[PDB]
Amino acid sequence: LANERLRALEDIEREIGAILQNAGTVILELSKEKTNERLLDRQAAAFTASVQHVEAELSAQIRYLTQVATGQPHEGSSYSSRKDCQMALKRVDYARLKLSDVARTCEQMLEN
Amino acid sequence: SKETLLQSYNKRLKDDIKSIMDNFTEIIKTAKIEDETQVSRATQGEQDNYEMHVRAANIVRAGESLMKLVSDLKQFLILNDFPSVNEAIDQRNQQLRTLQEECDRKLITLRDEISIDLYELEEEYYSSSS
Amino acid sequence: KFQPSLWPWDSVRNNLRSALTEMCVLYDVLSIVRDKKFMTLDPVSQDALPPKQNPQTLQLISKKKSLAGAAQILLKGAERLTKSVTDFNSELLRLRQHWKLRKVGDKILGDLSYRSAGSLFPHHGTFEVIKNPLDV
């Protein structure tokens, strides 16, 4: 559950990285002198690698979603266990109130 | 249908990647300096400035659309990826069963201790002389 | 001075309509040029001397300024994305982890009844999910 969702979070961050690499590459090209042309090539390869693996991750996840889609609303649930747990907790609360009353009558008896 | 929605997601992804690549390549191509002929330096330069700004805006818009696609895919996964619903349901069920069993063990032990105290109190009260 | 109730987006309309006036000027002048009457054409061979090396230097400074503005808008959008990611679907994670949900149309609904748990009660517990982070 955290796996595919964390993949989606990573692809969010890498879309940001793609835009920042676009911006950094045209930043270096706008310079009056741009000595680090090797670093320009590195930023260009970084940009294209970012776009390519963003495409790879999203295509893979659309494929995986195509494999496990059904168009049906999933008739499973967990309601009955929550109901039984609520009844158990209210049993405990009822016993707590009754124990408070018995202890209060014991304090009234011992108090005199 | 589900197939139709998945196709539409595929179409959006292909379109966004294509648009980012095309806009960046076109900006790089315009960035070429060429010799002028019948273009009047000043007009050519303003037109080029407008083109670059519009293409950068288009790249940012494509990034926003990719964010929208990621959000829609996340919603689809949270709503109808059957395996994870089953593991969530099973984990919830097992946790609630353990809480119920703890409550019932506490109550049963409480009943036994209270019963022993009740036996002592019954003996004392009924055998009181008064 | 009043306009069809456009109190924002007026200056953009001023610039665009000024462009519309000079574009109607272009259509006007080339149309009246295109007919022989009221305007005519004469082929003249004339030559100009450029006083400075204009294409090299002008293309240089204009392209560096254009690339400067393009990198500005790109990196501004980039840092907007950085601050933008640093909450709805996490609450959909928690809500789906406790409740039974589905999607019809654009709407996202949920079941509240025990009909999954076995009740034949003739009442559907459809509650809507409403983004407002989340509400029911």
UniProtKB/Swiss-Prot annotation, chain A:
GO terms for molecular function: transcription coregulator activity; ubiquitin protein ligase activity. GO terms for cellular component: core mediator complex; mediator complex; nucleoplasm; nucleus; ubiquitin ligase complex. The keyword Signal does not apply. Pfam families: Med11. InterPro entries: Mediator_Med11. Belongs to the Mediator complex subunit 11 family. Component of the Mediator complex, a coactivator involved in the regulated transcription of nearly all RNA polymerase II-dependent genes. Mediator functions as a bridge to convey information from gene-specific regulatory proteins to the basal RNA polymerase II transcription machinery. Mediator is recruited to promoters by direct interactions with regulatory proteins and serves as a scaffold for theee assembly of a functional pre-initiation complex with RNA polymerase II and the general transcription factors. This is Mediator of RNA polymerase II transcription subunit 11. It comes from Homo sapiens.
UniProtKB/Swiss-Prot annotation, chain B:
It comes from the Eukaryota. One of its GO terms (biological process) is RNA polymerase II preinitiation complex assembly. One of its GO terms (molecular function) is transcription coregulator activity. Residues 84-113 form a coiled coil. It is found in: Nucleus. One of its GO terms (cellular component) is nucleoplasm. Keywords: Activator, Coiled coil, Nucleus, Transcription, Transcription regulation. Component of the Mediator complex, a coactivator involved in the regulated transcription of nearly all RNA polymerase II-dependent genes. Mediator functions as a bridge to convey information from gene-specific regulatory proteins to the basal RNA polymerase II transcription machinery. Mediator is recruited to promoters by direct interactions with regulatory proteins and serves as a scaffold for the assembly of a functional preinitiation complex with RNA polymerase II and the general transcription factors. Component of the Mediator complex, which is composed of MED1, MED4, MED6, MED7, MED8, MED9, MED10, MED11, MED12, MED13, MED13L, MED14, MED15, MED16, MED17, MED18, MED19, MED20, MED21, MED22, MED23, MED24, MED25, MED26, MED27, MED29, MED30, MED31, CCNC, CDK8 and CDC2L6/CDK11. The MED12, MED13, CCNC and CDK8 subunits form a distinct module termed the CDK8 module. Mediator containing the CDK8 module is less active than Mediator lacking this module in supporting transcriptional activation. Belongs to the Mediator complex subunit 22 family. This is Mediator of RNA polymerase II transcription subunit 22.
Curated annotation (Swiss-Prot), chain C:
It is found in: Nucleus. Keywords: Activator, Disease variant, Nucleus, Transcription, Transcription regulation. GO terms for molecular function: nuclear thyroid hormone receptor binding; nuclear vitamin D receptor binding; transcription coactivator activity; transcription coregulator activity; ubiquitin protein ligase activity. Ubiquitous. GO terms for biological process: positive regulation of DNA-templated transcription; positive regulation of transcription by RNA polymerase II; positive regulation of transcription elongation by RNA polymerase II; positive regulation of transcription initiation by RNA polymerase II; protein ubiquitination; regulation of transcription by RNA polymerase II; RNA polymerase II preinitiation complex assembly; somatic stem cell population maintenance. Belongs to the Mediator complex subunit 17 family. It is linked to Microcephaly, postnatal progressive, with seizures and brain atrophy: A disorder characterized by postnatal progressive microcephaly and severe developmental retardation associated with cerebral and cerebellar atrophy. Infants manifest swallowing difficulties leading to failure to thrive, jitteriness, poor visual fixation, truncal arching, seizures. There is no acquisition of developmental milestones and patients suffer from marked spasticity and profound retardation. Progressive microcephaly becomes evident few months after birth. This is Mediator of RNA polymerase II transcription subunit 17. The gene is MED17.
